[PDB]
Design an enzyme around this catalytic site. Structure first.
Site, PDB file in Angstrom:
ATOM      1  N   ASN I  64      -9.222  32.411  10.063  1.00 13.72           N
ATOM      2  CA  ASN I  64      -9.972  33.554  10.656  1.00 13.72           C
ATOM      3  C   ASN I  64     -10.239  33.354  12.159  1.00 13.72           C
ATOM      4  O   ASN I  64     -10.782  32.344  12.558  1.00 13.72           O
ATOM      5  CB  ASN I  64     -11.300  33.832   9.914  1.00 13.72           C
ATOM      6  CG  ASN I  64     -12.002  35.100  10.421  1.00 13.72           C
ATOM      7  OD1 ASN I  64     -12.705  35.066  11.438  1.00 13.72           O
ATOM      8  ND2 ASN I  64     -11.747  36.239   9.762  1.00 13.72           N
ATOM      9  N   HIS I  65      -9.818  34.335  12.957  1.00 15.88           N
ATOM     10  CA  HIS I  65      -9.876  34.299  14.391  1.00 15.88           C
ATOM     11  C   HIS I  65     -11.309  34.232  14.940  1.00 15.88           C
ATOM     12  O   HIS I  65     -11.566  33.481  15.870  1.00 15.88           O
ATOM     13  CB  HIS I  65      -9.139  35.523  14.994  1.00 15.88           C
ATOM     14  CG  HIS I  65      -9.682  36.848  14.551  1.00 15.88           C
ATOM     15  ND1 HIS I  65      -9.448  37.354  13.290  1.00 15.88           N
ATOM     16  CD2 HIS I  65     -10.434  37.777  15.197  1.00 15.88           C
ATOM     17  CE1 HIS I  65     -10.053  38.525  13.168  1.00 15.88           C
ATOM     18  NE2 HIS I  65     -10.641  38.814  14.318  1.00 15.88           N
TER      19      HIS I  65
END
Ligand SMILES: [Cl-]
Ligand SMILES: [Cl-]
Ligand SMILES: [Cl-]
Ligand SMILES: [Cl-]
Ligand SMILES: [Cl-]
Ligand SMILES: [Cl-]
Lengths: 170, 170, 170, 170, 170, 170, 170, 170, 170, 170, 170, 171
Positions: I64-65
Site C-alpha cells: 500500500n502506497h
C-alpha cells in the site's frame, strides 16, 4: 570450396564427426544440417566442435535455402534415409534440409543408408532412378549385413561408405 | 460467392492484406488459411482485420476440410510454394490447407511463387504439368529478377501477380 | 500370428476397439500405432485396455520400424486416409506408421476411408493402382452415403468395412 | 425436447458415440457432460462430432447447473459408476455433473455400470433403494459375465444396456 | 546517413516494409524499433528481411538509447499513435522507443496516424503544438475518410502518407 | 442506451456489481473494462455474471477502442484513480481503457476515488481542471474519513458515491 | 498371501516403513497406496525401498481397482482418517484408494487415526457402526493423550497401534 | 472472541467483505477459509484487506484443522452450498474447510444459500435435519424470488441473510 | 527517522549499497524500492543485505502506497531517470514507486541522473521547474563528462551525487 | 561378467559407441553411466542402441550405487576427466558415477583424457599416485599433440586409448 | 595483455565493477566469470557494461577452459571463497571457473574473502600452503573487524583488497 | 537453552530423523534441521517442520548465512553422515549451505557416519576421518552391522547412525 552435409534420421548420423574431419582437409568450410527427424540422433553442440556452421531451422526458422545452397559447391545427404530420398524425388520440401536440396540438384550427392527392405522397395528404386535421370549423383552403396546390438539380430543394409570414399565421390 | 486464400511459407505472404482488400470487391467472403510453415510469415490477428475467417488448425484441430472446401466457390494458393505444389501433385495432405486443396481440384487456382531454380526443377515442372492435366488452374507467372534486400543480391523468381490479375484469373 | 493396426486421422478411428476385439479372436497379439495427425482422434490408454502394445513414437522416439515390422504377419491400415495412401504410394515415411508400412508392402492391407472427392481424386486413384501393382492389398470399398451429425448434411464416403469383413480380407 | 448424457469413469464411456446417435433420432439436442474422473476415458473433440454441446467444467468453470438442468427434459447417467451413484444418493456435488443431477431428481435416469462386488456392496444397494424412493429411475440392469481383455480374466459386472434399451427406458 | 523507423500500435504498421524499401534508396541503414504495444502488430523476422537492424527491447533489455540515437541522422515515428505523440510531448519514456525519441528531438519527425476523434482531442492538439515549439517536425497529415473492413464502417483518420512523401519530408 | 464502466486499481472496484445492477435499471447494456493495474482487484468471471460484456485486452489484444467507444452512449470511470485521471488529462493511452476514454471525452464521466494527499496533489488538481475545460464531467466527490481495516488507521479519502448517485450524474 | 496398506492424510503415515517391515515377516507382498491428500505426507521412492509395489494413480491413472483388490488377501487402511472412514461408509470412491476398498469390504481392516473430536463426532461413530455391520474390521483403537510438538499443546487422539498389533489383528 | 467464515462455491461469496466488516464490530479476529470450489469466486488478496488471516490450503497444505478450529469461538458457513452441507452431514472432509468443520460441530452455524430445487432435494433436507440433531445451528433461511441478470430468468433461492442478521444469530 | 530510496532504470543504481550504508548512520530504517524498469539493474537479495525492507510490487502486488509513504520522513529518488521525473511531474503513477512519490511531494527529494540531451530537453527542464514550484527538492546536480566503458566514448551526464552529499541535501 | 563404462565431461565421450561395441565381444552386459557434466556431451537414446543399461540419475534418482557396483566385475572411467580423477582421490562423490566408483576401487580402471596442463597440474599427479597406492589401475596414457578444429590451434593431451587397448588393460 | 576475474559466492562480488574499471587502465581486456553459487550475487548485464566478455556456462555450456585460460595473461580470483580455494588445492573442477584455474596455476592470483573461522580452519590453511608451493600467488590478507548490517553484529573477516592493491600484486 | 542443528545427508536413514528430533527436544531448546542437496530427495521438509523448530532450505532462501546459522548453535551434528559429506568436510569443500556451516564450526561438530562398509573402509574415507579427529571434530565410534536389505533382497554390511539416546550421550 564449401560443402554442406545433410544428416537424416539414422543411427549412422552419430559418426558424422569423422566425416566433418576428413572433409575439412579438402574443403574450406564443412557445414552440417539435420532433417527434423534427424535432430534427435545428434547433438548440435558436439557437431559445432568440428563443422563451421550448424544450420538449425528450429533456432533460426528464417534461414534462407537459396543463400545456403549458393554458398556451397557440394551438398551431400549422408546418411540418406529412404524417406528423404523419396521426398526429394517428388519435390517434397517441408523442412529446410529438403528445400536446400530441392534448389540444387546439380550440386547434390546422396549416400543411401537404410535397411534392405526399404532399399529394395519398388517406389524407392524408381525414385532413385528418377534422381539419377535428373542429374543427382547416387553412391553405388554396397549391400552389407551385420549384427545389430539394439535388436540382437542380423540386419541387411545399404550403408553410408567410409569417409575417404565420400571425398573421392564428390 | 466465397473465395479461400491459401498462404504458403514465402515472404510474399505479408502482402496478403492487399489481395484480401481487392478480392472483397468480387467475393462475399474472403477467408484465409496458412500452411504450417507459412504461419511464421504472417500474423493471424492482422489477417482478421481484413478477412472474414482465418482457419487455424493449431487453434482448432478438428476443422473439417470437406466443409471448408464446400463453402468456397474458388480456392487459390497465393503465394504457392514449390513444396505445396509438389505435395498437391502427389496427393500429400498432411496439413489442413493441403487436405482442403485435395478435396477440390475443380475449384483450385495456383499462383507459383519461388526461386527460379525451384521453378525450373524437373520434378516441379513435371508436377505442374500433372496439375494442369487434372484440371487445376495454374497462373502463368512471369519470371522476374530483382534486388533482394535480405541477401544483398539479385535473384530470379516467379512471383504472385498483382491483385487485379488474380481477380481476372479466377 | 500377430497383426498391427495403423490408424490414420479419421473419426472412424474411434471404433478401433471393436476391430481389436474381433481381431484378437484370430491373432495372438493385436498391436496398434497411430499417425501423428491420428493421435488426436484416439485415446492411447483406452487402446491399451484392448490391444497388447500401443506404439507411440512421441513417448518413445527410437522405436525401430524394422523390428516392429518383423514382429507382425499382417499390417492393416484402418481407417486409411487419402494422405497416408498417397504418402505410402510415393515412399514418403516421415512418421513411424509410414516407415513401418514402407518396409512391409507384402504384408500390407489398406482399408480406405475418405470423402468421395478425395477417393475420386485422380492422384489418389493413380496411387491406389500403383500400390496394387506393388503388391499392397486394398479393400474394394464402395461409395456409401449417410447423414453426418457434425455437418448436418449428407456426405458421400468410402468407409472402413465391418470387423468380420476385415478378418475375411487379410 | 433435450437430453443430457452424464458420463462417469468407466471404459464403457468409450461407446457413448452410439448412444448419442440413437438419442438424436428422438430428441432435439443431445448434450454431454463428463465427471472429472470420466474425462480421461473420452475425447471431447470426438464427442463434439456427435453431441450438440459438450459441457466442460475445466474450460468454463462458471457453467451454471440450474440453467443446464432447466434446459433438459431428460438427464441420464450412462455409464453410472458406483461412486457417482453413491455421491448422488448422499447429495454430494463437488463437480458439475453431480451438481446438475442433484438439481434434477425428477428428470434423472441411472444406468449402473460396475463390477458385481461394487453393485453387491450393501452401501451401494442401500443407496439405490434410497434413489428409487426419491423418484430417480434406475435401469433394472442384469448381471453379465464376460472375458475382459485388459485383465485376461472373466469378470462379472452390471452393464449399461444397448442404445435402444436406453430410448425405451427414459 | 542512417534512419530509424519507430513504429507504434497501429494496423498501418503492417505496410512498414514499403517505407523501408523506399528509405533504402537514400539512406545507408534503415533500422526499426516498435513500441511495446506495437510489437503485436508486426513480425520482427519479416522486418529483418528489409531493415538492417531490428531493435528488440524484450530480447536485449540493455540496449542503450543514447548509442542508438547517436547512430542515426534522422528518426521518424511512423505510424505515430496519439499515445506515443502524447507521451513524447510530456517526456514520458517508459520503453526503449520513447527514450530514444526523448534524447533526439532535433532529429525527430512524426507521422500522425489515428482516428480523427483522437487527432482532434484537444490535449493531443495542444501536445502537437508544444512538440513543434520544441523543434520536432510534425507531418501535416491529411484527414481522409475510408471504408474499414474490420468494423464494416466508414472511419475518419489522419494517416501516414505514402512512402515517397516520407522521403521528401526528411 | 449503453454504458461502459472503466474500473481502475482501487479496492472500491470490488463493489462494482452493485453499480452494474443499478445501471442495468436504465441501460440496455452495461459493459465493463478494467485497467491493467485494476485487473488484480477484480474477478472477470464474477463480473460477467452481472455485466453484458467484459472487455479483456489480455484475452483479446485487438479490441478496437473506436468500435467500443462508439457502441457506448456514456463512458464512466468508477473508481477513478489518480494515475488514470492524470494520464487521461495528458492524453497518455498505453492500455485499452485509457485509449477508449481518449476517444470520447464528450461522453466521459469521472468518479475520483483516492486518498486526500493524492486528491490535493497540485498536479492532480491542475489535471482535474484541464479535464473539466475539455468537456469531461468530474463528479464533485466529497471528502470522507473512515477507519481502514487493512492498515488499522483512519484515512481521509475521496470516494465513489453510492450507485443511485452514479445514475443521477450521467 | 499379499497385503495392501492404504494410507491417508496423517502425519502418522511417516512411520509406515516400520509396519511394512513388520508385515514382510508374514506376507509375500506388502504393497502400498496413498489417498490423494495422503500423498503430500509421504515419499513414494522412499516407500519403494520397503514395499513391493507403490500404486500411484497420478502416474498411472488407469490402474484397475478390481485387479489390485483381487491380488490381495488383506487390505488395511493405516492410518485411517475420519474422511476416508466416512467416505467408505458412504460408498464414496472418488480416488483409487477408496475404490479398491469399496470393492473389498470382506478383506478390509481399518486403523482409526484422528483427533478425539473427529472420533467422537457422532457421524464418524455412526459410520464406524455401519462399517462393522457390513463386515469391515475396525481395530478397537485406544485413546491416548500426548504432547504435540507442532502445536506445542497436549492433544487427544485415537492412533494406529504398534506394528505387532497390526499383524496380530489381520 | 474469534470467528472463522467458511465460504463455499457461490456467487454470494463476493459480498463477504461486508460480513467481515460487520463481524469485526463484535469479534477480535475475523478469519476466512474457502472451499476448493469457492476459491474461483473470490480474490484472496482483497480478502486479506478486511479479514485477519486467510487460510489458503493450496499455498500452505499443512495447515492444521484442529489448531485452526481451536483458535475460534465460532465457525460459520456462509454462503453454505448444498454440496458442503451434504458432505458435513456425512462426515466427509476432503478439503481443509470441511475437515475444520468436522472437528467442531458445537461451534458451527450454517447459512444455506442455494437454488430452491437443491434446498427441497429430499437428501439435502435429511441432512439438514441430521445436523440440527447433532448440534449444528442452521439459520432459518427464507425463500426469495428474484431476477438473475446472469440467466435473464427469475430464480427461486434460499439465500444468506443480511450481515447484522448473521451477528444476532451467532 | 525513516528514509525510502527509490531506484530507477540507470546503471548508477548498482551503487546504491554505498548510499544505504551512509544513510543507515542517520536514519533508523533505510528502505528501498525499484521502478519496474529499474529492477533489471539491481539484485533484490543483495539490496536486502543492507536495507531493512525492499519493497517488491511483483512479489507483493497489494503493497500500500499510503502506508509506505507515511512510514517515511524522507523519500529520495536516486538515481532519478528522466522518465520518472517527467511522470511524477505529470501525476503519472503506473507503478508503486511513482504512486508512493505522488502521495508525498513534501517529503520528496530528487537526484537527477541522465544524459545531458535528456536533462536539456525543454520538456524535462519544464517539469523540473514545475516540481520545484510544488515543493519537491531537486539536487542541484552538476554536468560531468566521463569516458563510458560500455560504448567506448565520452558522455555528458548529470549524475547522482556522492552519498555524503545526499545526507547533506536530504 | 559385466562391465560399467563411466563417462565424463569430455568430447571423446562421443566415441563411446565404439568402446561399447568392442566390449560387448568380451562381456555379457556392457552398461554406461555419465557424470552430471558428461550428460550434455552424450545422447542417452543413442547409447541405448549399443549398451544394455544406461544409468540415469536424473530419470531415476534412487539408483543404488552398491547394487550397481556389485553387478559389475569391472568398472572403467573413459574418458576420465581431471575433475573426476581428483574427486575420486579425495573420496568426493556428489553424483551417482562417483559414488559407484567410491564403493569399488578394486574393480576400477581409469583412462585419463585431458589437456596436458591439467595432467601436469601437480595436484592431479599427486592424486594419480594416491589412487595407484589404493589399488586403482591407471592406464599409462601417452602424450599426443594434435590439431583441434574447435580452437584452430594445436593442443597437447593425454587421451583415451583405442578400444582394443581398453580390452587388453581391464 | 588480458586479465580474467573469477567471482565466487560472496557479497563482496557486488563491488567488482570498481575492480574492472581500474583494471581496464592497464589491461586490454578485462573479462569475467562467476562460480555457479556466485551467479546469484551479481547481475550479468551490469557486468557487461564494464567488462569485455562475461563468460556464462549456463548460457554457453561448451565454453572451453583451455581456450579461455590461454587467452589471458593473469587470472585472478576475487573475491575468493574458502570453497573455491579448497576445491582448487584439491584439483576439483566441477564448474567452468574451477576448470580454468586448474589449467593455469602459474597465472593465478587469489584474494581470499571469508569469515575468520573459515580462514582459520586448519584445512583451509593447509590448502593455502599447498597452493603456494604449487606456484599460486595468494594475497597476504589481514583479519579486519567490520560491523555487518545483514546480521546487526560485528564480524571478523579477511577481505579482498582495494583495486589499486590488486593492480600492484598481480 | 542450547540449540542443536541436525545436518541430514543422502541416505535412507534420514527417513528416521523425526525420532532423533523428538528426543533431542528433551535436551535442547531449539532443534533445527538442514539437508544436503542430494539429501533433499530423501525427506519431506514440511513433515520435518512438524517436529523441528527451523528447517533451513537453501533452495527456498539462497541467501541464508552460514556464519549466522552456525553461531546460533551450540552443537552441530551430521546425522546420517554420508561418505561424500565426510570427505568433502575433511577437504574444506563447501559447495552447499550444510557443508559451509560445518566448515565454519569444527569445534562444534559431531559426525555420525552411515554408509556401506566398502565406503567406510575406503582408505580415503579412513584417512579423512583421522584428519577430522586431528582437527577436533567428534566422530561417533559407529557400530558395524550386517542386516537384510529389502530394497536389494540381499545382506549388506554398514556403519549406521546410532539410536537417538546414544546421540544424546555423545553430544
Ligand atoms: Cl468396475
Ligand atoms: Cl485509431
Ligand atoms: Cl487429527
Ligand atoms: Cl542516460
Ligand atoms: Cl564468510
Ligand atoms: Cl550406502
Amino acid at each position: 570450396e564449401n560443402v554442406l552435409i545433410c544428416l537424416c534420421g539414422s543411427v549412422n548420423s552419430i559418426n558424422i564427426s569423422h566425416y566433418i574431419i576428413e572433409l575439412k582437409s579438402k574443403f574450406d568450410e564443412v557445414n552440417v544440417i539435420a532433417s527434423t527427424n534427424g535432430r534427435k540422433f545428434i547433438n548440435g553442440e558436439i557437431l559445432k566442435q568440428f563443422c563451421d556452421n550448424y544450420y538449425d531451422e528450429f533456432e533460426d526458422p528464417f534461414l534462407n535455402h537459396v543463400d545456403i545452397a549458393n554458398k556451397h559447391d557440394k551438398i551431400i545427404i549422408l546418411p540418406a534415409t529412404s524417406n528423404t530420398i523419396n521426398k526429394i524425388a517428388n519435390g517434397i520440401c517441408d523442412n529446410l534440409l529438403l528445400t536446400i536440396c530441392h534448389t540444387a540438384f546439380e550440386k547434390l550427392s546422396i549416400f543411401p543408408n537404410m535397411n534392405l527392405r526399404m532399399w529394395e522397395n519398388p517406389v524407392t528404386q524408381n525414385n532413385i532412378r528418377l534422381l539419377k535421370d535428373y542429374g543427382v549423383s547416387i553412391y553405388p552403396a554396397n549391400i552389407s549385413e551385420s549384427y545389430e546390438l539394439a535388436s540382437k539380430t542380423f540386419k541387411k543394409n545399404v550403408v553410408a561408405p567410409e569417409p575417404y570414399k565420400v571425398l573421392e565421390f564428390i
